[PDB]
Amino acid sequence: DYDLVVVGGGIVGAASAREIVLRHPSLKVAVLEKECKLAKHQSGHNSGVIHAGIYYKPGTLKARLCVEGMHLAYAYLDEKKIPYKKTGKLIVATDEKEVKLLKDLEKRGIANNVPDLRMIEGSEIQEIEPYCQGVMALHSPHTGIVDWGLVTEHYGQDFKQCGGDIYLDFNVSKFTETKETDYPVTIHGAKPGQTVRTKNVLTCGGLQSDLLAEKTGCPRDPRIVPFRGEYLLLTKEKQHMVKGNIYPVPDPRFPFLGVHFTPRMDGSIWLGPNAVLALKREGYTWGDINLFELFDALRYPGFVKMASKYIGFGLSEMSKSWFINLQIKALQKYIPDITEYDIQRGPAGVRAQAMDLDGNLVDDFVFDRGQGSGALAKRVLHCRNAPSPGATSSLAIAKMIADKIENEFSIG
Amino acid sequence: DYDLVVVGGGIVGAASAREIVLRHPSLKVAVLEKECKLAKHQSGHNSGVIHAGIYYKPGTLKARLCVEGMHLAYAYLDEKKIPYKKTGKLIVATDEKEVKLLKDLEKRGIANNVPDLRMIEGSEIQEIEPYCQGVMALHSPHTGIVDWGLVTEHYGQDFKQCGGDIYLDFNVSKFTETKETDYPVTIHGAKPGQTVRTKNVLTCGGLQSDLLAEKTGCPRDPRIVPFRGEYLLLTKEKQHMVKGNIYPVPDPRFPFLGVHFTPRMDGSIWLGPNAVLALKREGYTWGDINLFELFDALRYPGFVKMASKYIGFGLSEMSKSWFINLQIKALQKYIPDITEYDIQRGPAGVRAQAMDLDGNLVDDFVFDRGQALAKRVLHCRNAPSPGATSSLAIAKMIADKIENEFSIG
Amino acid sequence: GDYDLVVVGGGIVGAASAREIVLRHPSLKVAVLEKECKLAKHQSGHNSGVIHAGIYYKPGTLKARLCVEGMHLAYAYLDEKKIPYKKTGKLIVATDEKEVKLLKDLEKRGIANNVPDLRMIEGSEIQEIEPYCQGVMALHSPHTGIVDWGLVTEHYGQDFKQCGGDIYLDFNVSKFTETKTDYPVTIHGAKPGQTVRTKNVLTCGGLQSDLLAEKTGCPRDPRIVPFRGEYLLLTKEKQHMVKGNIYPVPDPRFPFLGVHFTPRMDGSIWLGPNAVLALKREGYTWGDINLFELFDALRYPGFVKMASKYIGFGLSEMSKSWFINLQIKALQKYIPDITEYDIQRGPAGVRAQAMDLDGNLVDDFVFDRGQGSGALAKRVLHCRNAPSPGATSSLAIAKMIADKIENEFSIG
Amino acid sequence: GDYDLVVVGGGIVGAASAREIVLRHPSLKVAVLEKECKLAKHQSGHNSGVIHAGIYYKPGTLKARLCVEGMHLAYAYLDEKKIPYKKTGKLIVATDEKEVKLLKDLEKRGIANNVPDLRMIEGSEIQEIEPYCQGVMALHSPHTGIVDWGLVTEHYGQDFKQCGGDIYLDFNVSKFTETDYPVTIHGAKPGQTVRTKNVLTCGGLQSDLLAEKTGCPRDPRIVPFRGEYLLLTKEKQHMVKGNIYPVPDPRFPFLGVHFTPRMDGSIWLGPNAVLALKREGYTWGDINLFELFDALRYPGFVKMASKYIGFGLSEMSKSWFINLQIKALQKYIPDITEYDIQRGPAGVRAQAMDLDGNLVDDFVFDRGAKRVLHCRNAPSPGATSSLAIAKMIADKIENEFSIG
Ligand SMILES: Cc1cc2nc3c(=O)[nH]c(=O)nc-3n(C[C@H](O)[C@H](O)[C@H](O)COP(=O)(O)OP(=O)(O)OC[C@H]3O[C@@H](n4cnc5c(N)ncnc54)[C@H](O)[C@@H]3O)c2cc1C
Ligand SMILES: Cc1cc2nc3c(=O)[nH]c(=O)nc-3n(C[C@H](O)[C@H](O)[C@H](O)COP(=O)(O)OP(=O)(O)OC[C@H]3O[C@@H](n4cnc5c(N)ncnc54)[C@H](O)[C@@H]3O)c2cc1C
Ligand SMILES: Cc1cc2nc3c(=O)[nH]c(=O)nc-3n(C[C@H](O)[C@H](O)[C@H](O)COP(=O)(O)OP(=O)(O)OC[C@H]3O[C@@H](n4cnc5c(N)ncnc54)[C@H](O)[C@@H]3O)c2cc1C
Ligand SMILES: Cc1cc2nc3c(=O)[nH]c(=O)nc-3n(C[C@H](O)[C@H](O)[C@H](O)COP(=O)(O)OP(=O)(O)OC[C@H]3O[C@@H](n4cnc5c(N)ncnc54)[C@H](O)[C@@H]3O)c2cc1C
Ligand SMILES: CCCCCCCCCCCCO[C@@H]1O[C@H](CO)[C@@H](O[C@H]2O[C@H](CO)[C@@H](O)[C@H](O)[C@H]2O)[C@H](O)[C@H]1O
Ligand SMILES: CCCCCCCCCCCCO[C@@H]1O[C@H](CO)[C@@H](O[C@H]2O[C@H](CO)[C@@H](O)[C@H](O)[C@H]2O)[C@H](O)[C@H]1O
Ligand SMILES: CCCCCCCCCCCCO[C@@H]1O[C@H](CO)[C@@H](O[C@H]2O[C@H](CO)[C@@H](O)[C@H](O)[C@H]2O)[C@H](O)[C@H]1O
Ligand SMILES: CCCCCCCCCCCCO[C@@H]1O[C@H](CO)[C@@H](O[C@H]2O[C@H](CO)[C@@H](O)[C@H](O)[C@H]2O)[C@H](O)[C@H]1O
């Protein structure tokens, strides 16, 4: 049936399958997606921001992939004529304690060759953002916005135009060895009789990458810990208050960039996302929990270790979500004239945050295969984590994943 | 934009929208479905059985709808060349107390003109199911199996071929009196600028029929109480032990038919469905809990009343679900050589069980309308069971209702 | 100091054993440690008040003789101390022919156990004993009576104190240590400086017998699983409808006798007790949950095995407890003119039900000691379980325990 | 079994009030009912054991006067009855310049309350009183002391019995009925009744529940706040000599986790203020579903939570993870580690809350059966001001019931 099957129709799975068929036009490739459309999850519930590569440690692959992907993204958006807006970014420091870290971000930004990075303070802050306070600001004019869900759909259309097959409504449930065939791996869906046979498998399952890796025989670690990213909607009567992206100076101990003011493609102004621990892999709303997710995430050895040191930051995120009057006061340090009457609760996304046994939040590439003999081992590779930000670096991530499965499966 | 809009892409919403455009080929009709495809919920997570109409009280509309819908369905499957199998059904009794209840089902099935219902003695059971036990059984040779999701999609294509528009990914969130116009009702989705104008609306929202009715001004009752229906997967090494449908003798006090043996179009044998109270409206996943949906299901004044009488039967369902060994012990009364190692927990559906203030499990049509939006939005908050088998007959009923209600034609 | 022997537990078993030993050996210096500020605050003070005759128990067993002997010892002790009691009698009523088969099994065990004046009663003779009670056949035990077992326990204590024994109320035993020489065991209370030294220790800690046994190195099994026993009160206007004890025919697979009609000493008629799994060791109130004692009742290996067979029997007890109307319908099989409006919710007790690793509800004697040769392993004996019924069998249990520690500790 | 007045509650407030009223009116037949089998089983027997001096409280208010007078009456009572105490001075230590301004506020309020002999003490001077303690500035209250308040409560009850009062232990007041003595009080045991002309309630953690039994509004509700203590190892008890208190947030009635010696020489660290999920929830795992539902559904709860949830979560997190509590304590005693502390006992504060979310710290009296008065709250600190609180309650009883 297929030489290679990619499980996962997100932006990482779609860009991977697209990059693979472009390199190898004779390879019969399929994509299996449990939902009925691409980019239903992480790739369709994001900030829509095209990152430039400021915060990332210089000389590392993460810093390279973001700057790589950003230029590859803008070029791809021009090639396919996908709408986008280069709104620019302002990382605003509110006190002299945040300018010590802001200057560190300036050094990292320049070393990563972020285009046109410049530090700014005084009245120049109100030149870019007339309603924004702040001691000192970092200006990144090439940070833009886009619909990453629409981009993912274009990845799938490019994949199909090269002969690729996309199976929507295909919930991968089990892998089995084919009867003694040239396609030794059959993939089973949740619907009876729904199967697909293949030589090799790559999985890009986002919020369920650890669960997918277990069905091949991989260890439970790194576990995917869901972090809900909630957004607030600024009222249309005050959408003029922000023009581009206004980011805070975040704590560099964590990969999160903090709650930020970001315009959407349709003109809306979204405030977020935050980082509240979800009690469900797809916990898009508060109170939508899964008890197996609760009992297993709390008993995961890495969980207690991270909470032992960073319980305060997580509780502060949840408290500011429970009572948005605490959130708007944090937002008034940047835009003071926003009140509780100007914001409403908006939609949310869920980060697939990888975590090791020590409690560290994994931000590197993690590829994994089972420990069998063995047909389901050796032939099923699981991409359990890709470096952030996955949407901006998607085209650069795809080239790394294409190299990985080429060396792992002897293709080309 | 449209004259009538049907909210709900399930089998009941699709069949009604298809029936009304076939009766009135000049009506501009649309379908709004919050998901990305049709039959994503009840119509796509069912037992796949074409019921014959045995259990239902003679003379009632429910009894007529199931036998008529069953005949209309088989004609539609032949008409569209949709795959199906007439596997037949056995309703097996295991002791003599169950025999009395079985004899009542024979009288009802004969009064309902179920063709061709016959009672067989325990010796003749193995002529139909060689591995099944039992002292007596009711034999329904025309009970069948089908992919109701594929049938629901064919309803939509028929609807599309007649000129109807299907809006997928349209999560109806608000109804609005149109500002200006010949289309007084506006329907708002969850996305900005996602609207559709209409003259009349019919909702068939399944698990959210009560929440949809509330948006017009209808009372919170009857409430939709979700009942999870779990399925067990039998290994292929024992699939040969079940030829057709093997059903137990159920308690006539409830609308549930019990955990049964049923082949899929796959040929694989599924054991179910369950009848476990769900802690979430769309609680397909086992441990999924919604605190709002659970606290509202338990604070509903009808919940404590029905639980005060029948919580024992509900508790027996969950313990057999918690401990599969107890469910295996029950199924061995029919197929003895099946152990716990022969099964695996499979997917589940969620029944949209309507319930009034008195705790009754409503099992008939419930239409509702506000006290603009009150006269032009009709909500079908419940339809008679079984919805899939009777879908074509239910749609004829529903088309009759909105034809009189909205003066269509 | 201090003492030769210390009995931990001020219940009816610890008090009776301590009373029996000082009577056998008047020169022995014995003390009783009880954590509450009074005797018999738990099981011995929250019971049905019934003096059992010894009908249900297997002939030839030690449990069968202890209850028959204990009942004769109890009435003799009650007369001697002028403690008020009432020989109300007991009717074990069968309602169908299946319970009739189980009833004559009970009668034959009662005859073999030498239960005095046991007579099988039939049809209309039932109304001569209980005019308002129905049934198809009943077993009549005229010598089954009622008493305040809590008052009996305090009488054991005053007998103990009159013979020179010391009672330490408000002494919560926290740990045993070696006195590094005339009294090698030191017992520590909760408050610092609250210590007592002795040569040998017997524990009768009821709901915490397993927790006490772990403190000197014994295994966690058999673990005490708490079963709340709830009672309902009949309105005074209908007390006349119940003259004596009216019991149902129980399932012999379980130690529990069913919900029964029992008059109290003040003329009250109590309906109970049931057998509902407590979510807390001392869970006398519904809703009182202890996360530790709950999460360790489950996850205990014997629990899931026991539930995998009998979960339905426990849930029916719960369903009738939550919905009193379901309990009244079952009680109407015996007394029909009793409605839901005629009853009130009353107090509850909690059974200290021992459970082995296989999931069996242990109902016999269980002793335990440390696994070494040191002071703690050799000088501390734990009674992890006493046979049912503990209150009726107390005087007989005491002589067995007295015989046991006489051999184990070379006393006398 | 018949009495003129019955006091429900055998804590320090109920015992001191019953003692005060029989001393004023020796012919009044008075009884006290206590549901436990001993006095001072709860708040009065699970406290910091500190005799406060009256530093934090606003001058001119009833709180500031009752504590200063109460501690003077307490010291005189302890000397008269020969009850052991130690008189280990207090040190309220500020650790940053942002804390010295709040400490100066406590000094101005302390001198206005006439706390002897309050004196602001500078950084170099801190080691002269606590050699191991850090700080940039501190407030020295040498007359603050320690005592076993449970032993004091039992001495109140003995004075009450010596004057002819009857103490009914193991008497769980469950119901009030009309019966001379028109009020009949029922216990939980069969046939356990007393009759009386008037009733006074001092039910601590169940004061709001007792007020409901006679038909009073459910507000103010008692919200339980568990107060956990940590135990310093014996090897480092020499590192603190007396009370070492921090500079607390003046918006709340809590004084914060502090270093405090006990009568046996032990050093206890606490108490914190974590929301308990049970009225008598002395341990973290011990919760009550009913006494969790209603505390959340109480209209005042979410109002206070919407403003100060961060302070409650900070308390809980430091309780869940000891390392975070140690880092806070190291600002005062730097050379202690997790190996130097162990988890200790806990108390539960009967914190009264109004419908607006305010933590009530004043007197609250509630009449119904019009012969039943419920003291739903007494001002803090209840133990130190016990004898002063009793006189006020005695005045209220004499005017409400016309005794004398
Ligand atoms: C709140 C939020 C905001 C973000 N903002 C930005 C931003 O501004 N800029 C940026 O560059 N990045 C951003 N990101 C990151 C970006 O969204 C992700 O890195 C990226 O979407 C990851 O893509 P993915 O395909 O790996 O995950 P997904 O998009 O979630 O893809 C996983 C897919 O696998 C499918 N799947 C899972 N299990 C199975 C199975 N068993 N069978 C079949 N299919 C299965 C799922 O249905 C899903 O479609 C944001 C992320 C979040 C959470
Ligand atoms: C476990 C199970 C087994 C069954 N087995 C059988 C069987 O063997 N035989 C048989 O005949 N019947 C069977 N049934 C019954 C049958 O499946 C249902 O009666 C039938 O599918 C009901 O159709 P429906 O369209 O009303 O429900 P649904 O299919 O649930 O349709 C509701 C639709 O409304 C949509 N919707 C809801 N809210 C909104 C909104 N705000 N905006 C837009 N769209 C919205 C939902 O997305 C959904 O697609 C079974 C049912 C269950 C639960
Ligand atoms: C609901 C119910 C009804 C019953 N009805 C009857 C009946 O009708 N007839 C009959 O014959 N029997 C009856 N029984 C059985 C009888 O009540 C018990 O078998 C018996 O009372 C148990 O005696 P015990 O002293 O071992 O238990 P307990 O009375 O519980 O004594 C244990 C004591 O040890 C103390 N303790 C525990 N840990 C420590 C520690 N660390 N330090 C100090 N002290 C400690 C406890 O505080 C307690 O006082 C009934 C039991 C129950 C639960
Ligand atoms: C952790 C903590 C530390 C403290 N530290 C200090 C300190 O250092 N200095 C200081 O001055 N103060 C301190 N306090 C305050 C002091 O302990 C209390 O203010 C004081 O004990 C209140 O006394 P009370 O009698 O009102 O409460 P309680 O002592 O709780 O008395 C209430 C009594 O009523 C009884 N009761 C309740 N319901 C019924 C019923 N239905 N029938 C019969 N009886 C019933 C209870 O059994 C209980 O004995 C502290 C408090 C806490 C919680
Ligand atoms: C297991 C449970 C424990 C949870 C595990 C640890 C969770 C850690 C969460 C990391 C926090 C999310 O990221 C955090 O976002 C906040 C909120 O914007 C940022 O905070 C920043 O911006 C906000 C406004 O947005 C300002 O008011 C604030 O003064 C400033 O610090 C932090 O600089 C950043 O670190
Ligand atoms: C909301 C809380 C309270 C819940 C409310 C009550 C829920 C009602 C559920 C009714 C039970 C479901 O339907 C019930 O299915 C079971 C299981 O097949 C049938 O049971 C029958 O078949 C099974 C095999 O499956 C046999 O082992 C069993 O002996 C026989 O009685 C019952 O006859 C039928 O009544
Ligand atoms: C921990 C989870 C699993 C729980 C473990 C299993 C618990 C088992 C408890 C056994 C039940 C208690 O004991 C059980 O009481 C019931 C109810 O009175 C008795 O029932 C009997 O009397 C009652 C009236 O009281 C009648 O309505 C009934 O028809 C008759 O059978 C049973 O004969 C007896 O077996
Ligand atoms: C119901 C949910 C919401 C809960 C409601 C809000 C609860 C508020 C509780 C108030 C906090 C308890 O009291 C609080 O104790 C802490 C910890 O000692 C004190 O904190 C002080 O001392 C600690 C060490 O002890 C120092 O590390 C700290 O820098 C200093 O501020 C606060 O000054 C005081 O305000």
Numbering used by the authors:
A (entry chain D): 42 to 221, 223 to 454
B (entry chain A): 38 to 217, 219 to 409, 413 to 450
C (entry chain B): 41 to 220, 223 to 454
D (entry chain C): 41 to 219, 224 to 412, 419 to 454
List passages from the publication reporting this PDB structure.
l-2-hydroxyglutarate dehydrogenase (L2HGDH) is a mitochondrial membrane–associated metabolic enzyme, which catalyzes the oxidation of l-2-hydroxyglutarate (l-2-HG) to 2-oxoglutarate (2-OG). L2HGDH belongs to the d-amino acid oxidase (DAAO) family of the FAD-dependent proteins. Like other members of the DAAO family, dmL2HGDH is composed of the FAD-binding domain and the substrate-binding domain. The active site of dmL2HGDH is located at the interface of the FAD-binding domain and the substrate-binding domain and is composed of residues from both domains.
Crystallization of dmL2HGDH in the absence of any ligands yielded crystals in FAD-bound form (dmL2HGDHFAD) and in complex with FAD and SO42− (dmL2HGDHFAD+SO4) in which SO42− was derived from the crystallization solution. Structures of dmL2HGDH in FAD-bound form and in complex with FAD and SO42− or 2-OG were determined at resolutions of 2.85 Å, 2.30 Å, and 2.82 Å, respectively. In the dmL2HGDHFAD+SO4 structure, there is a SO42− anion bound at the substrate-binding site, which occupies a similar position as the C1-carboxyl of 2-OG and makes similar interactions with the surrounding residues except for Leu299. In all structures, there are four dmL2HGDH monomers forming a tetramer in the asymmetric unit. In each monomer, there are an FAD bound at the active site and a detergent molecule n-dodecyl-β-d-maltopyranoside (DDM) on a surface groove. The DDM molecule is derived from the purification buffer with its hydrophilic head lying on the protein surface and the hydrophobic tail pointing to the interior of the protein, which might stabilize the structure. In all structures, an FAD molecule is bound at the FAD-binding site, which adopts an elongated conformation with the isoalloxazine moiety pointing toward the substrate-binding site and forming extensive hydrophilic and hydrophobic interactions with the surrounding residues.
